[PDB]
């Protein structure tokens, strides 16, 4: 389905997909200007990560299609998958130890020329 000419992918980003998905829901299908404004405004780590990936996707589309400006572009699809995990130890009382997982996420954004 993907026009892989027009897309950006960010692998192993430092946030959990459970925390990045809602921000993706708020910009899926919006216009590029509106999405960029939302991501700049909202002070969430996932918001900043999506901002980088979305800006890169728009840049790729513009570079390969010179007659496409920032205001014909809308964020067509947005996918947020889960990535590698790292386990570190958190020690507790009575010699008990717990493993403390750190999750990463993959982010895939495709833009498309507006309706």
């Amino acid at each position: 389905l993907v026009n892989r000419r027009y897309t950006a992918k960010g692998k192993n980003l430092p946030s959990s997909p459970k925390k990045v998905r809602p921000i993706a829901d708020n910009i899926r299908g919006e216009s590029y200007i509106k999405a960029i404004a939302v991501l700049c405004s909202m002070p969430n780590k996932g918001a900043k990560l999506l901002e980088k990936v979305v800006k890169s996707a728009a840049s790729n589309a513009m570079y390969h299609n010179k007659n496409l400006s920032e205001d014909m572009i809308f964020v067509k699809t947005v996918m947020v998958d889960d990535g590698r995990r790292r386990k570190k130890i958190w020690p507790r009382a009575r010699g008990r130890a717990d493993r403390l997982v750190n999750r990463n996420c993959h982010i895939f954004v495709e833009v498309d020329e507006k309706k």
Binding site: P22, I23, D25, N26, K34, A37, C40
Partner: protein, 59 residues
């Protein structure tokens, strides 16, 4: 004080989707630069606000 049976994916999904929900901030385009800024906040891109300079935006 411990879960008695593992909840169904439906219940987990429902709770997660309802709770992990962030709301969009309101917007209003800057009178100076035309950027979409948060309503009632200084523009982060040009510094003006109701036609008054307050910041000096750098790099």
């Amino acid at each position: 004080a411990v879960p008695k049976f593992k909840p169904s994916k439906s219940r987990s999904r429902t709770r997660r989707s309802i709770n992990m929900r962030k709301k969009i901030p309101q917007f209003q385009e800057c009178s100076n630069c035309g950027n979409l800024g948060v309503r009632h906040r200084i523009c982060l891109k040009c510094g003006y606000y109701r036609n008054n300079q307050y910041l000096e935006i750098g790099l």
